[model samples]
Target: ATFEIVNRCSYTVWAAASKGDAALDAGGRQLNSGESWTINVEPGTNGGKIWARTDCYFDDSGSGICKTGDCGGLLRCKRFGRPPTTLAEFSLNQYGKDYIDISNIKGFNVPMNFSPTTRGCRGVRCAADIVGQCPAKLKAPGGGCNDACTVFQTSEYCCTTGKCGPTEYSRFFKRLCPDAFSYVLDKPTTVTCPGSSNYRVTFCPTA
Candidate 1:
């Protein structure tokens, strides 16, 4: 299967994807404004995550940092990127189904949308202007909104023992984009389709 990562923002974005245990190239790439990168993956495997890295300054050997969604200081990630990032996670052909979601539970960095190119598959999006109205209590150092779990780290905020539920902070995030994950105690944030579907993940589609 192919994961088409589209950059619809005004500036460039460094797209990242983890393909199971093999990992990705440490020297990823710069997807210029309006450009797109397609990563091929084998179907009927475990889930993998995808996201965009912003404001990156990698050196010639591909070593630097991204202001947001930095993948362990490497251009390509051997694992998931740092949090406060918007993620579109998918697991295709797992028991003949496709699972997907746009998560802000880790907090949101940029507006994102995921759509299926295959017929009979539905599209999902979390395209709110989150940075424009990020809550002061849960703002990230690099900008954008931070999920309560990352902000307070309190057992109450994180629901460590399931002691807490969605608070006003999470509600604020839900208000911005209800489709995305807002808190620790989730209520069906993941979307599952009947078949493995090709997807196009677009960052900042309205530039």
Candidate 2:
């Protein structure tokens, strides 16, 4: 029988499948929203399990920015449609080397914060020092601001009690795995953080 797979999410998806007991480790392809595709399957083949999944390429609401080499921050597998069979979610850290399996299909909506989990820096910690302060330029000893560090520096620096809140490590997770189930990032960056220096300087995730 021929079956149609529909993408109910706001973003695109990547899908794949394998036979019974066969290692299903092949990367899938993309499926866009309101899009449908047909697939042929043999009855009772591989225990009738067709492994299909999706990746979040961009924000459906159109508030988030999509960056290259930052799929975890942009793409989410959970936003995809529910799979008929068991599925898995994985993410490569900001460095693009560390790989983490969020969970099987059963654990849908599992928090997949990659930045804090792998990068070892929290957005909240980065925003703590900056809140309500007027924008200032960080000039070096030469009387000129560093260009490289400019991107990391912010205009204001102050703190808001219970306002600068925890970092949204799960934002990256929601981007990478949006289909498993509904997951929300309770703690996200409220204020921007300070930038980093050339050597041995602290870098802020938010600019």
TM for every model, in the order presented, reads: 0.91, 0.27
Writing each residue's lDDT as its tens digit, candidate 1 over 24-139 gives 43325678988988777668646577778888988887778988778777777766777678888788888888888887877888789988877666677888888778888877
lDDT of each: 0.78, 0.26
What's each prediction's clash count?
0, 22
Tens digits of per-residue lDDT for model 2, 143-165? 21111112232221111232332
Instruction: Report the C-alpha displacement of residue 82, candidate 2, in angstroms.
Output: 15
Model 2 TM-score, 2 decimals: 0.27
Candidate 2: residue 148 lDDT (0-100)? 16
Task: Tell me how many residue pairs clash in candidate 1.
Answer: 0
Q: What is the lDDT of residue 135 in candidate 2?
A: 24
